[model samples]
Target: SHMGGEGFVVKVRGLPWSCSADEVQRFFSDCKIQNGAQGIRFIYTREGRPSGEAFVELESEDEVKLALKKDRETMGHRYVEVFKSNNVEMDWVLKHTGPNSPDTANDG
Candidate 1:
């Protein structure tokens, strides 16, 4: 679960098939860096070639929120999209912090 889980993660798409991790690492500059970037190691095939996709681990859920504010940007002919993802599926009951979640149930 990468410690705190997916809320602290961001998925990036449309990278050049030949893009480097350093380039992906730079995309989140406005979002802030709390620690070293997980960046785009990119998905590799059995032959270990670029699958042209990747993600990163951020410092916190807040970093994730800010990262989502990202805009139209590109890597070569591909205009990259950045957004938050848990990658793994779970329920609101488990996190207990989202809207209508258990945490909010008591407050309301």
Candidate 2:
């Protein structure tokens, strides 16, 4: 799995649409300096929408904890929210889709 060993992944939301994987990697490159670690792996979501999110793999639990402590509200035009990624897909399916009807019903 992508999140198997070394460390845990963090999810970052509300990033600028213009932000690239490399840009984010650079922004957190200081993580290595502050924590004395290698760096992080970043995966950027698809562009052109208001939604923005990415995953970063830290080298150790200490690094993850440090990042959570230091950069939870790193300032930007868009407010960034950071948290430990669940990385799990919701399995429930919706039964109703029509605009006029109740929007969602549990699928059997």
Candidate 3:
């Protein structure tokens, strides 16, 4: 049976204020063995924000579940949130935040 499909993308948050994309990638890379081979995409919310988030694509549902089990709080000061990635309305998540939201004005 095919293993890959459109579904949950692990969301990681609470990254350090000084964390960078490379650093985030490295963090995941370090945990790759326990988590399994996967692609990590980190999105840092604007400055003055409480936390930064990231999405990771694992090889299968099993891998996804394993990652969540093994690395939910794997990093210090950065807890991970894993959920299904619904392709629909991704733009909404990327854009809208509500009226006068700090995200509206680039803080990062």
TM-score each candidate. Answer: 0.63, 0.51, 0.49
The per-model lDDT (C-alpha) reads: 0.58, 0.45, 0.47
The best candidate in terms of TM-score: 1
| Cα RMSD to the true fold for all candidates | 8.4, 9.9, 10.3
Off by over 4 Å in 3: 1-8, 26-38, 45-51, 74-76, 89-92, 95-108
Deviation (Å) of 54 in candidate 1: 0.4
Greater lDDT among 1 and 3 belongs to: 1
**Residue 108, candidate 2: how far off, in angstroms?**
26
| lDDT by residue for model 2 (1-108), tens | 222223355555566767766665665554442222222223322443334555565665675555456455553466666555322310010111111322355899
Clashes of each: 0, 0, 4
Give a tens-digit lDDT track for model 3, residues 52-74.
55556555656556555645554
Best by lDDT: 1
lDDT of 3 at 58: 52
lDDT of 3 at 91: 27
What would the per-residue lDDT of candidate 1 be over residues 1-108, giving only the tens digit for each residue?
222245666666677877687777777776654456543346555666655656566777888877666735876677877655553411321233222312233564
